[PDB]
Design a protein around this nucleic acid. Structure first.
Lengths: 127, 206, 114, 79, 96, 98, 144
RNA sequence: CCGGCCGGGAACUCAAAGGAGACUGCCAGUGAUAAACUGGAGGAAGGUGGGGAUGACGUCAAGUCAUCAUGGCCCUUACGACCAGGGCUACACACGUGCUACAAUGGCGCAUACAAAGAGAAGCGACCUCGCGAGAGCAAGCGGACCUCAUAAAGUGCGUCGUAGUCCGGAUUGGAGUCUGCAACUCGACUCCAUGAAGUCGGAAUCGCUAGUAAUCGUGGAUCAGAAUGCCACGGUGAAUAC
């Protein structure tokens, strides 16, 4: 029918919609190889679909915003694994075991006063 | 020099603000400086009245100054000519039509402004500091006051070196943020210079 | 390849071998090859002789080697003979354009003495 | 440099230059106004420019014209 | 900070809203692509403190020139003192 | 139609005030949308905490301005008569622009 | 490391060959957080390595890296100590990459393809680093 | 009109308010049957989850009398006040902290993708026209999840350069300008043309960092008429290693 996952990763947000069907991926009205598939690691949006395979299983209409390249990609990975409530809690044994349902809650650490960035302390002279 | 002001770290937690107006950036500085003038005036002209707080709020082009004091009768006076005089001059300062109210601070020995002003007054009447501090801690612990700490400092008894000599009784949990710590501070201009009086009063745990 | 003087550049793209002429950088070189109707990435080898003296005819319209060196020298001499701030400053060998001489005036002032 | 619209001189220096060229170059001029671009009518005058402590005389040659006054009056004495 | 300096500041503001914003009109309107005469460039014999680029923005309470904050109108020292007492509304410690 | 946009420094105070304006309006008139929240403006100030040198000791502060939007639809005369002169809020700026 | 015994974090394998070994090799090669550039260099260099040696991809890589793995490494004593396997191939990759940065060819894919090819018949620079380490631990064998 | 553009839908992202959640709570083992530790399940998170705020009694007679307040001393036709010009920007030198480099994991040209956080009325200033450009003219919209600043850049895909002090590097200097401001000479910022040093990875020594960290890439803000390579913030890519 229509199966949803929220799926966010360092300032991104990937709405993942799943219908059963072919093996196509539609991201922001754009194909996978044209969105970021000219770039690094388009494999990670396909990692949840190699735990049991996507060969001709389900068409997924996904819509991500915020973040960078890798942020959006990790957001779609988490979005698909949140959106594999298509099949029941079976998958979420093995899908838990690959470490995919974990929201990777690493965010950029704030800059702190008297430090040039988050931990790089400015260099100190003689003693 | 290392402790946070124990009113400022509790401003959203338990303690309220003494100014509760909203203003955009065009009049924030002007409203703020107008508050410095009305607290400066209204602090100087009620020096005998034992005033604790003066709370400003501005509901739609009009000030609403609330004087938390321990002696409301001396602020109001024989039929309240002193109040209408004060709102006349506060209306002169702020430039808005002024209202003014008086809230009676009963139990005045549990208010840190009144305690610090008390010990400061006694120090500039040339009494010994250990009596002022120690009496203040005793009579404050006598009525409620789950803790109190007073701390005078600076050239005490007319010395040529400056000490502190704080006292405390009970529990004053100053790193606990839900503690209702009433802290305030005064300065005693003696003939030897300034003597700083701080006083923390722990009232309750929430 | 002997264009605009004794300058003989070669075996290099024409936008860049023209930069050997004292008084043409990248912009002016794009202007020469565009004004002479020449592609930007041809060499001087693989370029005809009529084509070369169209480049001579174009490079002649800007102040280059000798005229430019004596024009610059003339400007600096005018300043140093006025005895203005820029001339005294130009004369002592210290930075002109209001820079820091307490430290780090070192191109203009030369490698450090004692 | 500066200024697409007009060069700059002070109005008091304008009047002192007009009166200085009308009645002939008689004396050096006390000028504090170093802000001021030398005009072609100022050629031949001796205008003393203030350098913080001293009015130093500047005889105006023809090629002074695209310049401020204070260029010809150094303020720091380095030895 | 030196009474004289605060008085000097009030002089500069009073001249700033007497002459200019009324004859600063000149520098906005006549120094322009219209004709020209040298005249209005020379009509800056206005008393030089009418220029609004000569206010310093001193602290409202202590007249301190540095460390000013335009929102509060105070130096950083009186911003902190008043901020902690609670006279600046809404303002509190920040942590994120 | 009639947007009332409220701003205050205290979120309890602004949602009290907007709850009062909502039940006032839809009690008297009709067709109130609801208190839409509209992002909080956090203005941060980083002062030097010492009266002399010591850059690295600084104190960070903030003012959070909260908005709420109401957007009352029906222009009843009863809701604009009853909507005026009834705020009882002290630190709220309202904008009742049509 | 004073107190804290640690875990380790899991790296994603290589997107072309599924090799976490080669994934750590593109992390050893990466500079300034630019991973795309480094994996381009590794794919080009190992692709010409597989074309030159004619074997395959990561067994040519695994042979060329098998020739540079140290066996053991080194009052001031320089004792010989047995290298752990993760440290073994970590040092292997660090020496290959460092020696490839030392070379004087054109592109990084040629410097590293020629360095892995020079390590396949174990005559390059990283093998001289391995023989150097093994001369230090072989000379000082007297401390165990 | 293929643009959430419209009618519309309130699911979803999100906004902001209110709640739930994580406590060694459960299991196994070790332990004085105690504290606890080690491991496991569930779970978004697992053991003070990450970060911040919070800095005990005191030490350095540490810093500030120049933010302010203040005892005493001192000047009170002056050590007070007003003004213009100058200086704080000086330069044989030495040290600190940074930026930009020495390049091919790059330089340049063309196309093209993905942010977060902010500021704005004496302000931010679209569109359109002119200028190579900094900018100029007319001038909407916005006191602002609506408008403007404002195109993120590293990335990617093509082409070129080819190990050269070079298509590296940009200092320095000449000329021509724009803007702000009474006024850019001392003494701004930026632009255009030209110039094109030193520098080929840094001696003794020394510093920072334990994971969204270092590294690297941009963006914003405060002060401010104009002036950041600094400061304070924000996100993009994203390591190595800990016996």
């Amino acid at each position: 029918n229509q199966y949803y996952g929220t799926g966010r990763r360092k300032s991104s947000a990937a709405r993942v919609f799943i219908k059963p069907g072919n093996g196509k991926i539609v991201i922001n009205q754009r194909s996978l190889e044209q969105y970021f598939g000219r770039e690094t690691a388009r494999m990670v949006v396909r990692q949840p679909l190699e735990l049991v395979d996507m060969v001709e299983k389900l068409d997924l209409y996904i819509t991500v915003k915020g973040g960078g390249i890798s942020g959006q990609a990790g957001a779609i990975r988490h979005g698909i694994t949140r959106a594999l409530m298509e099949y029941d809690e079976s998958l979420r044994s093995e899908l838990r075991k690959a470490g995919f349902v974990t929201r990777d809650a690493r965010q950029v650490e704030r800059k702190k006063v008297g430090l040039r960035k988050a931990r790089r302390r400015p260099q100190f002279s003689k003693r | 020099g290392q402790k946070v002001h124990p009113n400022g770290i509790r401003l959203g937690i338990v303690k309220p603000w003494n100014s509760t107006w909203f203003a955009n950036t065009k009049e924030f500085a002007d409203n703020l400086d107008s508050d410095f003038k009305v607290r400066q005036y209204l602090t100087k002209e009620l020096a005998k009245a034992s005033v604790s707080r003066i709370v400003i709020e501005r509901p739609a082009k009009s000030i609403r100054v609330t004087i938390h004091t321990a002696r409301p009768g001396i602020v109001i006076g024989k039929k309240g000519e002193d109040v209408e005089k004060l709102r006349k001059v506060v209306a002169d300062i702020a430039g808005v039509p002024a209202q003014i109210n008086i809230a009676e601070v009963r139990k005045p020995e549990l208010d840190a402004k009144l305690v610090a002003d008390s010990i400061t007054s006694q120090l500039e009447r040339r009494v010994m500091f250990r009596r002022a501090m120690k009496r203040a801690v005793q009579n404050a612990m006598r009525l409620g006051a789950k803790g109190i700490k007073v701390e005078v400092s600076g050239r005490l008894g007319g010395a040529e070196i400056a000490r502190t000599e704080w006292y405390r009784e009970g529990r004053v949990p100053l790193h606990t943020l839900r503690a209702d710590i009433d802290y305030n501070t005064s300065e005693a201009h003696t003939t030897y210079g300034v003597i700083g009086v701080k006083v923390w009063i722990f009232k309750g745990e929430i | 390849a002997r264009i605009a003087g004794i300058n003989i550049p070669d075996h290099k793209h024409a936008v860049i071998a023209l930069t050997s002429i004292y008084g043409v950088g990248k912009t002016r070189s794009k202007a020469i090859l565009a004004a002479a109707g020449i592609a930007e990435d041809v060499k001087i080898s693989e370029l005809s002789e009529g084509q070369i003296d169209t480049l001579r005819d174009e490079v002649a319209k800007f102040v280059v080697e000798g005229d430019l060196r004596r024009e610059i020298s003339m400007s600096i001499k005018r300043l140093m003979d006025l005895g203005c701030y820029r001339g005294l400053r130009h004369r002592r060998g210290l930075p002109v354009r209001g820079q820091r001489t307490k430290t780090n005036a070192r191109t203009r002032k030369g490698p450090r003495k004692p | 440099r500066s200024l697409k619209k007009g060069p700059f001189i002070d109005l008091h220096l304008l009047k002192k230059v007009e009166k200085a060229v009308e009645s002939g170059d008689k004396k050096p001029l006390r000028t504090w106004s170093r802000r001021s671009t030398i005009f072609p009518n100022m050629i031949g005058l001796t205008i003393a420019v203030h350098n913080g402590r001293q009015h130093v005389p500047v005889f105006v040659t023809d090629e002074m014209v695209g310049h401020k006054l204070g260029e010809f009056a150094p303020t720091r004495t380095y030895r | 900070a030196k009474q004289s300096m605060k008085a000097r500041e009030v002089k500069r503001v009073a001249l700033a809203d007497k002459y200019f914003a009324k004859r600063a009109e000149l520098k906005a309107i006549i120094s322009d692509v219209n004709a020209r005469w040298n005249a209005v460039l020379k009509l800056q014999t206005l008393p030089r403190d009418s220029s609004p680029s000569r206010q310093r923005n001193r602290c409202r309470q202590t007249g301190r020139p540095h460390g000013f904050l335009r929102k509060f109108g105070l130096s950083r020292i009186k911003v902190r003192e008043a901020a902690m007492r609670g006279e600046i509304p809404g303002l509190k410690k920040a942590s994120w | 139609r009639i947007r009332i946009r409220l701003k205050a420094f205290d979120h309890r105070l602004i949602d009290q005030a907007t709850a009062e304006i909502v039940e006032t309006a839809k009690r008297t008139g009709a067709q109130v949308r609801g208190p839409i929240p509209l992002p909080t403006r956090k203005e941060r100030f980083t002062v030097l905490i010492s009266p002399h040198v010591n850059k690295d000791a600084r104190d960070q502060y903030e003012i959070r301005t909260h908005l709420r939007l109401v957007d009352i639809v029906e222009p009843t005369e009863k809701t604009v008569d009853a909507l005026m002169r009834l705020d009882l809020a002290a630190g709220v700026d309202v904008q009742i622009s049509l | 490391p004073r107190r804290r015994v640690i875990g380790q974090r899991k790296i994603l394998p290589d997107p072309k060959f599924g090799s976490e070994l080669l994934a750590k090799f593109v992390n050893i090669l990466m500079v300034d957080g630019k991973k795309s550039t480094a994996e381009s260099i590794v794919y080009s260099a190992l692709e010409t390595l597989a074309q030159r040696s004619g074997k395959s991809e990561l067994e040519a890589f695994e042979v060329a890296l098998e020739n540079v793995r140290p066996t053991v490494e080194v009052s001031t004593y320089q004792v010989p100590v047995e290298v752990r396997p993760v440290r073994r191939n970590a040092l292997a990759m660090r020496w290959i990459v460092e020696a490839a940065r030392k070379r004087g060819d054109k592109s990084m894919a040629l410097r590293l393809a020629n360095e892995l090819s020079d390590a396949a018949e174990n005559k390059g620079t990283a093998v001289k680093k391995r023989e150097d380490v093994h001369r230090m631990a072989e000379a000082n064998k007297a401390f165990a």
